[PDB]
Write a protein that binds this ligand. Structure first.
Ligand code: UQ1
Ligand code: ZN
Lengths: 188, 145
């Protein structure tokens, strides 16, 4: 009796095959993406409620940060490829966004090195076909779910996430209200 | 009000539109929504409802009751987030026009976004526009409604 299109989720008009199971986008540049992941760690909360050990993917976006984002992506393309991720998430948010201490490829490079990434084993993957492919397919991936803004999210290449059709005043609440909507759309 | 708006047209309108493409600056997404909840009054009370005839301007009353209004929070919501950001938000680079009416592609040149991360007087851009979106609200509500 209670689960609404345009409300808590929105279904995609042109949907996309071979798409990941749940596919959060994000930049290291949206003060909101920061708020989304760094403040509310919604990502983890969604994981938690999530059904039977399910592909919780997460791609980065190019538009914001122009020439830097580009590499910040590529950096991340690696960070998945290895991948540290978890280990390189927090500092790269904390870097670029919150303190303004990241200037380009190597500032990032450093934040990998500095986070337990092996000096130029990072560079050893950075140019690997592995990570060209990864990058290119996180452009493609966005252009597919026809993207505009970030954070975003897409259950099984079908449902754009509408964070709106949900409490907006209560944090603790909206989270579980968010993380829930996923458990639903997944097994559906 | 055609007198106000004719000189808000030939005096205020494009002090907007130009004096950005004048220094060739990049918009945002909310940008051209605010340009729309704008150029959809300085055109939508001119060729609008103060009209090419000025006996009956309560059609323009609603053309201001709920159009200067959008202009308010468009700028407001926009400006809200400047050092005060929010979880359930986004930050975009692309834009829209429902009703299969299509802003973007009609005028590629000015109905276009380019989403990114200065200074205007003792201020910057967006607030300075609440300084008129909420100005051309009350001191326009007062005399008509
Ligand atoms: C902060 O970014 C913005 C601009 O920057 C290029 C604008 O030109 C415009 C359009 C300018 C005016 C004066 C309406 C808006 C609305 C805006 O929000
Ligand atoms: Zn925390």
């Amino acid at each position: 009796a209670q689960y609404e299109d345009g409300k808590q989720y929105t279904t995609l008009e042109k949907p996309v095959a071979g798409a990941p199971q749940v596919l959060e986008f994000f930049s290291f540049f949206c003060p909101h993406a920061y708020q989304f992941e760094e403040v509310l760690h919604i990502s983890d909360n969604v994981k938690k409620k999530l059904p039977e050990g399910v592909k919780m993917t997460k791609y980065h976006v190019n538009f914001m940060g122009g020439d830097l984002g580009k590499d910040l992506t590529q950096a991340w393309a690696v960070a998945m490829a290895l991948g540290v991720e978890d280990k390189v998430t927090v500092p790269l948010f904390e870097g670029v966004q919150k303190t303004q201490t990241i200037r380009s490829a190597s500032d990032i490079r450093d934040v990998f090195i500095n986070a337990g990434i092996k000096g130029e084993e990072y560079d050893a993957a950075w140019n690997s076909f592995v990570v060209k492919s990864l990058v290119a397919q996180q452009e493609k991936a966005a252009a597919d779910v026809q993207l505009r803004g970030v954070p975003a999210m897409f259950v099984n290449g079908k449902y754009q996430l509408n964070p709106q059709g949900m409490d907006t005043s209560n944090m603790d609440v909206f989270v579980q209200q968010y993380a829930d909507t996923v458990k639903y759309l997944s097994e559906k | 009000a055609w007198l106000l708006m004719a000189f808000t047209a030939l005096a205020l309108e494009l002090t907007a539109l130009w004096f950005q493409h004048v220094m060739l600056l990049k918009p945002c997404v909310l940008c051209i929504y605010e340009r729309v909840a704008l150029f959809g009054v300085l055109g939508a009370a001119l060729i609008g409802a103060i009209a090419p005839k000025t006996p009956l301007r309560y059609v323009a009353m609603v053309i201001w009751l709920y159009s200067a209004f959008r202009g308010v929070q468009l700028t407001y919501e926009h400006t809200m987030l400047q050092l005060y950001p929010s979880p359930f938000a986004t930050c975009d680079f692309m834009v829209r026009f429902p009703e299969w009416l299509p802003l973007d592609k009609w005028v590629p040149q000015v109905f276009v976004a380019s989403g990114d991360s200065w200074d205007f007087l003792g201020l910057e851009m967006p607030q300075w526009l609440l300084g008129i979106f909420i100005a051309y609200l009350i001191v326009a509500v007062l005399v008509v409604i």
